[PDB]
Design a protein around this ligand. Structure first.
Ligand SMILES: *[C@@H]1O[C@H](CO)[C@@H](O[C@@H]2O[C@H](CO)[C@@H](O)[C@H](O)[C@H]2NC(C)=O)[C@H](O)[C@H]1NC(C)=O
Ligand SMILES: *[C@@H]1O[C@H](CO)[C@@H](O)[C@H](O)[C@H]1NC(C)=O
Ligand SMILES: *[C@@H]1O[C@H](CO)[C@@H](O)[C@H](O)[C@H]1NC(C)=O
Lengths: 50, 126
């Protein structure tokens, strides 16, 4: 059955876009990640490098 | 290599609407690596146009684009370990015209591909 959408309809019946994202568990090589850090560089000092 | 009439790889395990199948072709533009599943023919001769290697796609998981692989020798190593496929290469002129010469030439890896499909056979195209 078709929805009835009008600009004057109630807020409860107003359209709403819902996007649901689901990620599968760890069973394969990882393919999705994110930008962690963007730190700068120093020289001739005792530092901990990663 | 010389006169060639070579290039074109078709890998896989099954041959009938099952699993997936790799495909590597060189056309001086892009070394596309399509894992997409199709059906095939006996000797599909493309180029000079006509294109009838594949039959029907269902669904695919990897699309790749890279630079083309250019008395020589065309040497490749295809090796798969725990879902990672590795293809190495080398190209060097030689003086001997008879067979594989006497010499040493290590293979610099060219690509690493995480896929995770078991493979059992392969075939070369022309
Ligand atoms: C060599 O092969 C590659 C891969 O098949 C071709 O790359 C395609 O180029 C078209 C041009 O717009 C794109 O729309 C496609 O998405 C590209 N990929 C594929 C898989 O088709 C390339 O065009 C070919 N070069 C020549 C000269 O034919
Ligand atoms: C998609 O891939 C799955 C792999 O699990 C396969 O079973 C299926 O036949 C493919 N095609 C469609 C339309 O689902
Ligand atoms: C087929 O691929 C699956 C994917 O993980 C793997 O578990 C299985 O061992 C493969 N089959 C063979 C015979 O290696």
């Amino acid at each position: 059955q078709s929805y009835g959408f009008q600009p004057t309809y109630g807020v409860g019946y107003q359209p709403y876009r819902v996007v649901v994202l689901s990620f599968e568990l760890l069973h394969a090589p990882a393919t999705v990640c994110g930008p962690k850090k963007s730190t700068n560089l120093v020289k001739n000092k005792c530092v901990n490098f990663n | 290599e010389k006169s060639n009439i070579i290039r074109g790889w078709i890998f896989g395990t099954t041959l009938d609407s099952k699993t997936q199948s790799l495909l590597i072709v060189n056309n001086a533009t892009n070394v596309v690596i399509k894992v997409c599943e199709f059906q095939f023919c006996n000797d599909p001769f493309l180029g000079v146009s006509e294109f009838r290697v594949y039959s029907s796609a269902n669904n695919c998981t990897f699309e790749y684009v890279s630079q083309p692989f250019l008395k020589n020798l065309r040497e490749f190593v295809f090796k798969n370990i725990d879902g990672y496929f590795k293809i190495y290469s080398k190209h060097t002129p030689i003086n001997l015209v008879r067979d594989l010469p006497q010499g040493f030439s290590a293979l610099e890896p060219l690509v690493d591909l995480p896929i995770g499909i078991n493979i059992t056979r392969f075939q070369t195209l022309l």
